[PDB]
């Protein structure tokens, strides 16, 4: 039924798990599609759940996303940094905009691209409508957000802030090897050994 | 052609929303009247809720450029760009009808796109805001700082209040 | 229609029609017609037929101030109905020269409006429509001869008046039945 | 929504730890859900803290006030944690948390402003509804002043137009008590 | 949505403690559900109070009256609690609660007004339907007078247009008995 | 439109043409026909093109541009309100010494925008084409303004707004018209 | 519509405009203008300005055959763009009298179409558009001087040409820059 | 439209049942969420038993390339072989994922059809940004052609020539092309 | 779910190896049919499967996913037309195991050629028209095989919609007989 169930055994008896809750028992979380508040809250809740079950074991965050809303992405980002476990990140398909941000935000040494995934980074997009006074207020805010985002990308990639600023004024696409070279991820996963 | 008839008496009507084509129609009429006689006054009746600033400025500059004085007359209302054009009329020849109202405020706008472009378009509408306030101060006799304070939010003025503010010169009540 | 135009024809006799909803452009058409007529002859009366459910106050006030400004008297004739701004412009006609047809009706009420936005701006716009309301009530008290308080009480909700009741109220001067 | 049958999602899973999420637009039904969770948790244990995560652009004031008054009424402390953003009613409910237990995540943002509204109708009714939203605005300003430590006059000035705050600025403003960066 | 061997949604959990939520617009089906919950609760214990939380902008009068007559018919007291807002029919049902057991949360608001309606058709039918809504208005005013202690004439005057009341004003008017602030 | 001859036709006999609103094929064709007609009435006398436009379609704008250059009379341009994108391009394309801004008009310049949908092969074809158009427009812009090609390129990667005085300094127009002399 | 309009005036100068999408009714206007001009003077050139993205082929062929049938030469002038059928009609002008303005562009490609229905009917309509394609390629070859095989290769996908390239391709004979 | 259940008490939908037998269905257009579901099933199966084959039935008109590549790389990464079976059709990304199956274990049903072609895309915006997005989709086109060459045994040059326009193949033509290894007709 | 204990009436009949194909044929309902056949085959590769068909037809490739599954699996698939079997529905009806294809007495069958549609460059139009003509040929060949009619007869009869009563469908070779009352 759309999402398949699996049957796992006792403890107290047979119990049904949808395929995602099943993978969750293996410390795996999926980030898929556009980033927005509710899908982001779901991810946050999963991260919290997993930290609790075991604050010492790694969490694996698969990312396939075109990007999305920045504040929603930051609820995930700050959770990744806050919880005790390392969050290993794995890009499959693509990680663009906020998707790329969260990918590179993973634990150092534990950020990966699948061989044919692609990454894209760029500056924030936005929009307001209203009085000039309010326009200035909202324009200043998004410039502050852009700057803050550039700083964090600088931190996680190892690139200079100026390098990040220059490279993200317009859409920049990277292959998996180019992403390793850029510092967005640490290596490429090709085969289970 | 009741309007064409009145155009022959150097009367032009600015009615409704200010936008490029109705503004162009006003500009063409002003150019025509100037030509037919550069010495005689032109009368611009204004009844408008406002509209697009660049379209309004095409009228503003035409009003200043041509040789004849442009007398402005507010009937009903002159709001936003409508109030601007009302107050832009020739000194001593700007009028309100007794029950017209005037409203002044700052520019509204909107953009969508990359942050870099958002800054560019924000800087531009802020510059336009600044320029409009300077022109408003110039024509009303109010200080720039006074205009800035009074146009942050919508400000309504009755006809007598508009005379005192310097937006118009007097009220027309009955023909002489 | 009817392409000889029937209105252009009637305009030559200083007859103007205000028909349907009051808004800026039809109001501007009326103002233009009054100006033309004043010029054509500043001493002869103008006849304004009114059949209207009302409309935008500022557009209506462009007609009102024009009526008061020009030198000729504007005789007003209510046909069908004169409601809201229609009733206002009817009673605004030259004293002694305001008429209802026998089966026309008049309706008076307070202004309607609406805003959306910040509370500060809501307060600004509410304050404005209240000023307009007060001003409209003063002008109606003035033209009907009613006290301001009577106008205020009667326009809080829709008030319908027959042609005889409109004469009695002071909205018009008399009823026209048959041409003399 | 991460489902184990016995319909039991990740949120039900987190509720077992007295953690509640306020996410997205504030309105009557999502708020009723929040109130119900707080009532359930209080009973399960009236002495242990409740944790309310907030990620919201704001929403309807009367709905927000259902959550506010419930937060104050129940016996447990409600610790509030801003993630992503807390704007308008979201910021209001955030600062409404138990003193000392209101937090911002490092890269969350807070925004405060005055109420928005709208009416359509007769001038008399317009006036009734305008005075009502002005009364609501005053009440909100008083409560904000109370919870932040700012003066009423300061809140009034600062909320005439949208005001954005970083997490450090929100601490400095008194909206929250501290920034959470890493699990203890 | 939140769940808590056995499984049960949180509203079901609260229902077992005689708490019913009335949230949003009053209409036939949501009203049916409330009536049904009241009956269930009476059976479970005809002596213990029932608590009806109200957060509503109002709604359909006949729907509301199905709740009203049910509140009056059953044996248990129905204590009413306003959270967020109780407007129009929401306010009526709030004040219809058991005397001494009607409450406002400190920052909830109440609004009262007359019925709204509309018909279209022949003048003869227009008269029939106009006469009917006038009868409903009269009855609603009588019952409002009954529960508030206000005179019929005062209710009539006070409800010709929307009237908003703060929680203290609602106690003063007699719509509710007191304010709930803090648990014991 | 008032009669006196419609107001625009009346102005046309005085060699005045209005370019108003978005540039597209049919309004552009109207401009072109007016220019051909005027060239006719007198191949020696100046033509006046008032411009108030947010821009529009490039190929439509180029029909006006090439007509301006082809015909015998000088086409003097006057910006009122605004001249943006293609509107700015046509403004600066006027006869040298006869390009004007009204004092409170504004000018905006940027690169072309476009869009295609289809197979990668065709995307490549259409992408290369708009890139050629971009280069041609920058060369022509450099030509009429006096700016270097490299300068035009850098300044038009994003929207660049100019006041009437700034447009004069940039070389987009020759001077400001303030009062009829 | 600056007025007798500006187009009627230019028509008196044997100038016809083909502007926008090619379809039956605008095409019929062009054919009618050409017939009229042939009449007024069967020996003098007709000037056809073209600014078009293309359009319906049969509609374009009504113009094409009219151009060839009438006695006067039809000179074609591309301003802005001549794409698809627009480019076809440009190149179809009288030998030696086909022009591009300097910054006009030309685009050529194969026909587009679409059908839906039974497989049998799909086959009928596919066969037809393929015949139209072949016929258009032959005609393009004829007017450009290119070989049939060169046209076929160059029009499988959109091919853009600058004004100098269009002269070199044989689509037009020269570039007009300034009037003689 | 409901999914059939079975009682045995306990219950499960037939798809969950087939999943326990290591059968996964890829059906309809390829897009992120259905692709994620396929990825998750593959992960789950690798788990239950990293040595046993996984069977992916494919009936798809194609879809989003990046979504398809999330499946492609998962197929390549996991330890078990992924056998692919085309029923109905495998077009565009569907044909790509079909040919990406474990060598020797890629099948067409007798009346399935396969279609291969180059990527489609579209952008709107400034010329500078148009160039960036055109450059990117051309890189993608190139990468897909290389991978197609790899799995089919065709030369990169042959793949390039054959995919400029839609190319349809019958099941025997798909075997001859190297898209699949054989045709499944009847069960053993 | 409609009639459950969710365990609906269809799940109950599935336990008796009865599958329903109802309404328009498209990928997802087809996949559901395929999944049920696979499930039934595994539970018992020797017992017949019963496929009830009431369908106006639908997408050919979706239908062929069902067809090839029917032929691949070990059990015989008996087909029963109720109401109607039109286009792809008639095809799957006649695709059942020979001797085990039935019409109910007042069901009707309709056969015809493929329908389709494309839009684009002439070159691409040719590619897609050639493809639907190949599909048409293959479907005519398969219809001839299962009905016993000559290729020429199928072709002549399917250029336009051809309606058949249940007796006419038996006589045509589309089904083997009519089911009227249960044994
Ligand atoms: C909000 C908290 C309580 C939280 O998320 N708790 C639940 C973790 S999920 C979980 C826990 C145990 C067992 C099972 C699960 Cl799923 S917290 O650990 O992020 C937290 C938040 C705030 C504070 C403090 F600020 F009060 F110190 C301390 N801890
Ligand atoms: C653009 C001009 C020619 C203009 O508006 N001309 C027509 C005025 S309308 C008219 C004129 C004569 C007779 C009848 C009419 Cl309707 S101008 O007079 O505003 C003008 C514009 C520019 C320059 C100059 F910059 F070249 F000096 C000189 N004059
Ligand atoms: C704006 C004026 C000039 C006006 O309406 N003029 C045209 C009247 S219509 C007309 C006049 C003459 C012949 C034919 C017609 Cl239709 S006015 O008479 O209302 C007027 C308006 C303002 C002033 C003054 F303020 F300058 F004194 C003087 N007169
Ligand atoms: C309405 C009440 C009864 C309430 O929320 N009850 C249910 C609490 S949820 C719960 C309780 C016990 C066990 C488990 C759960 Cl989930 S109350 O505690 O808010 C309340 C409301 C009103 C009054 C009084 F006014 F009658 F005194 C007393 N108590
Ligand atoms: C119709 C009756 C039999 C009724 O509601 N019966 C079922 C009550 S719910 C119940 C009873 C026993 C055990 C369990 C439950 Cl849930 S009643 O006549 O007792 C009755 C009950 C209630 C009302 C009213 F409150 F709606 F007016 C009117 N009549
Ligand atoms: C196309 C032509 C004839 C044109 O526009 N003619 C009409 C000009 S409008 C006119 C002219 C005189 C009097 C009145 C009017 Cl409206 S042209 O003069 O631009 C032209 C175009 C092309 C060639 C040539 F290539 F054949 F040399 C020669 N002349
Ligand atoms: C259809 C015809 C009559 C036609 O277009 N006639 C009108 C030309 S427009 C014209 C001609 C002269 C004067 C004024 C005008 Cl507008 S024709 O000349 O193209 C024509 C068409 C067909 C035949 C014939 F086949 F019968 F011989 C002879 N002539
Ligand atoms: C992210 C991992 C842990 C993963 O997909 N786990 C879920 C496997 S599903 C599963 C496995 C066992 C039992 C049950 C299930 Cl559902 S992984 O095997 O793809 C993996 C990913 C990354 C790394 C490393 F980079 F850290 F080395 C090592 N392993
Ligand atoms: C894909 C396969 C394995 C399949 O359909 N498997 C699941 C059958 S359903 C089932 C099976 C066992 C128990 C319960 C159920 Cl429901 S197959 O039988 O169609 C198949 C497909 C391919 C090959 C081979 F090519 F590798 F030989 C062999 N078998």
UniProtKB/Swiss-Prot annotation, chain F:
Gene3D superfamilies per record: 2-enoyl-CoA Hydratase, Chain A, domain 1 (3.90.226.10)
Phenotypic consequence of residue 7 to A: No ClpA-ClpP or ClpX-ClpP complex forms
Recorded consequence of changing residue 1 to A: No ClpA-ClpP, little ClpX-ClpP complex forms
Protein's UniProt keywords contain Cytoplasm: yes
GO molecular function, one term: ATPase binding
Effect the entry attributes to changing residue 100 to A: Little ClpA-ClpP or ClpX-ClpP complex forms
Domain notes for this protein: The N-terminus (residues 17-34) interact with ClpA and ClpX.
Protein name: ATP-dependent Clp protease proteolytic subunit
Organism: Escherichia coli (strain K12)
């Amino acid at each position: 039924a759309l999402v398949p169930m699996v049957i796992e055994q006792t403890s107290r008896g047979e119990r049904s798990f949808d395929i995602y809750s099943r993978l969750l028992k293996e410390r795996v979380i999926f980030l898929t599609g556009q980033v927005e508040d509710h899908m982001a809250n779901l991810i946050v809740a999963q991260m919290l759940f997993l930290e609790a079950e075991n604050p010492e074991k790694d969490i694996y965050l698969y990312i396939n996303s075109p990007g999305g809303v920045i504040t929603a992405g930051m609820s995930i980002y700050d959770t990744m940094q806050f919880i005790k476990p390392d969050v290993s990140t794995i890009c499959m398909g693509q990680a663009a905009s906020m998707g790329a941000f969260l990918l590179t935000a993973g634990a150092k040494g534990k950020r990966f691209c699948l061989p044919n995934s692609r990454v894209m980074i760029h500056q924030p997009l936005g929009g307001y409508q209203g009085q000039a006074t309010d326009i200035e207020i909202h324009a200043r805010e998004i410039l502050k957000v852009k700057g803050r985002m550039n700083e964090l990308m600088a931190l996680h990639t190892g690139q200079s802030l100026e390098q990040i600023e220059r490279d993200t004024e317009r859409d920049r696409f990277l292959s998996a090897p180019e992403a390793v070279e850029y510092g967005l991820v640490d290596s490429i996963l090709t085969h289970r050994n």
